[PDB]
C-alpha cells in the first residue's frame, strides 16, 4: 500500500500470536517493541535514541507479520515509548520512501 | 525518487544558506536539526523519544529544501545526534511509504 504522512504511519502487526500497533519508522535501524514475553533465548543489549540509551532484550529469528507481509528477524524488547518497526524488517517487506 | 532502506535514508537539505545531510525519519513528528544558529524568535520546547527527553528551540516558517524540493515549516534545534526531517516537512514534498 501507499502510506502518506499527514498522520503517524501506524500499522497492525502480529507477533508471538498477538496483535499490536506499530510505527513504520525509517529513522530506526532496529525494531523495538514494548515490554512483553517472547520465547527463546535473549541477550542484553543497549540502543540509543533521541534522549539517551536504554537496555533491551534481543530476540533473534522472530517471525513478524506487518500489515499482511511476512518477515523474520531480530526484535528488541524494552522500555520504548511506542512499538517501532525499523529498517531491519522494513527492508524485508520491500518498503521504500517515495516522493 | 525512490529510496531503499538498506542504509539510513540520508539526503542533502538546504537551510539558512547551509547544506546538510539529514535522515528522512517517518518516525519523527517534527524536524530536529543539530545545534545551529538561526535568526528569529523561538520558543522553548521538550521533545522525547527512546531514552527520554531533550530541550530544543522552536523556529517557525523556516524555508528548507529537501533534495531540490521546497518546503517551509517548523524546525526544532537542539542536541540531537543527527539531523532529522520529520513528517511535518515530509508531507510537504509529497513523500510516501510504499510496499
Amino acid at each position: 500500500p501507499q502510506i502518506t504522512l499527514w498522520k503517524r504511519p501506524l500499522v497492525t502487526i502480529r507477533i508471538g500470536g498477538q496483535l499490536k500497533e506499530a510505527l513504520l519508522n525509517t529513522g530506526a535501524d532496529d525494531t523495538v517493541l514494548e515490554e512483553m514475553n517472547l520465547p527463546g533465548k535473549w541477550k542484553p543489549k543497549m540502543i540509543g535514541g533521541i534522549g539517551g540509551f536504554i537496555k533491551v532484550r534481543q530476540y533473534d529469528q522472530i517471525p513478524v507479520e506487518i500489515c499482511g507481509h511476512k518477515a523474520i528477524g531480530t526484535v528488541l524488547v524494552g522500555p520504548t515509548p511506542v512499538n517501532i518497526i525499523g529498517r531491519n524488517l522494513l527492508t524485508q517487506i520491500g518498503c521504500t520512501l517515495n516522493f | 525518487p525512490q529510496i531503499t532502506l538498506w542504509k539510513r535514508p540520508l539526503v542533502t537539505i538546504r537551510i539558512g544558506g547551509q547544506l546538510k545531510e539529514a535522515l528522512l525519519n517517518t518516525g519523527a513528528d517534527d524536524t530536529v536539526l543539530e545545534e545551529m544558529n538561526l535568526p528569529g524568535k523561538w520558543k522553548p520546547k521538550m521533545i522525547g523519544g527512546i531514552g527520554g527527553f531533550i530541550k530544543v528551540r522552536q523556529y517557525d516558517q523556516i524555508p528548507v529544501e529537501i533534495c531540490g524540493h521546497k518546503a517551509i515549516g517548523t524546525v526544532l534545534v537542539g542536541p540531537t545526534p543527527v539531523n532529522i526531517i520529520g513528517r511535518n516537512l515530509l508531507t510537504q514534498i509529497g513523500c510516501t511509504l510504499n510496499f
Binding site: 530506526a28 532496529d30 543497549m46 540502543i47 525499523g86 | 525519519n25 521533545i47 527512546i50 520529520g86
Partner: peptide
C-alpha cells in the same frame, strides 16, 4: 509528548 523515535545501536 514523545514524538521523535530516532533509533540506532552503539
Amino acid at each position: 509528548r514523545p514524538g521523535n523515535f530516532l533509533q540506532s545501536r552503539p
